[PDB]
Amino acid sequence: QLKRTTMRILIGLLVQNPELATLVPPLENLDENKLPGLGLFRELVNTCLSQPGLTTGQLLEHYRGTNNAATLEKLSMWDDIADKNIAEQTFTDSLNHMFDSLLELRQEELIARERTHGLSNEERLELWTLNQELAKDDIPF
Ligand SMILES: [Zn+2]
Ligand SMILES: [Zn+2]
Ligand SMILES: [Zn+2]
Numbered sequence: 499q500l501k502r503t504t505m506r507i508l509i510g511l512l513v514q515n516p517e518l519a520t521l522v523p524p525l526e527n528l529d530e531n532k533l534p535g536l537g538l539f540r541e542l543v544n545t546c547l548s549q550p551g552l553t554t555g556q557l558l559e560h561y562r563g564t565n566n567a568a569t570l571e572k573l574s575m576w577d578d579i580a581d582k583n584i585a586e587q588t589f590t591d592s593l594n595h596m597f598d599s600l601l602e603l604r605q606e607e608l609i610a611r612e613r614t615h616g617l618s619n620e621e622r623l624e625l626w627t628l629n630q631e632l633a634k635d636d637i638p639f
Contacts, residue, residue, distance in 0.1 A: 500576055504599065505535030505639040507592040510573035511585055512542050516557050518589050519546030532603050533596070535639025538566050569637050601628060 500506060512518050522543045530537030545560055546552060552560075554574055561567050579588065608625040611617060617625060 500572070500578065500635060500637065502578065503535075503639060504592050504595045505533070505539060506573065506576075506637060507579060507588060508596065509535060509539050509542060509570070509639075510576050510579050511589045511592075512539070512546070513557060513570055513574045514554055514576075514579065515582075515585050515589075516546045516552050516554065518586065519543045521586070521590060522593065528600070533599065533639075536596070538569075538639075541566075542570075572637065601631070604628065605632065 519542075525536070525540040525543065528536060528540070530540065542557070542561075545557060549556070549560075558567075558570055558574060561570055579585070605625065605628040608617065608621055608628070611621065612625070
């Protein structure tokens, strides 16, 4: 029994359906320290991309001996996300929620930067754009 979080859904669905890795856009330039679980998700995506067609068991075997192995095993047996008909739509929905959460963090970062350092022209336009858009169980993530 695990409560849903965005990153639990993404990592769990990917572990249970490694073919979903092909729907993930590039994550290489994201700061994993901004979002718990993002670093592990990125690792899993890259593992799937390096070995197309791998099974859940083969993906889990690749992570044996890592500090995330026990967490990946739990998520692999998580029945709450087991339904295959809705797996892809759920993955895509949660992918967009992840990026929305990063946009909120970026907006908060730019507000704090503006009070401490002022913003560049590019940053001020970025913050304005973000403001307009806004106007309109031991798993550690
Ligand atoms: Zn990493
Ligand atoms: Zn590896
Ligand atoms: Zn949603």
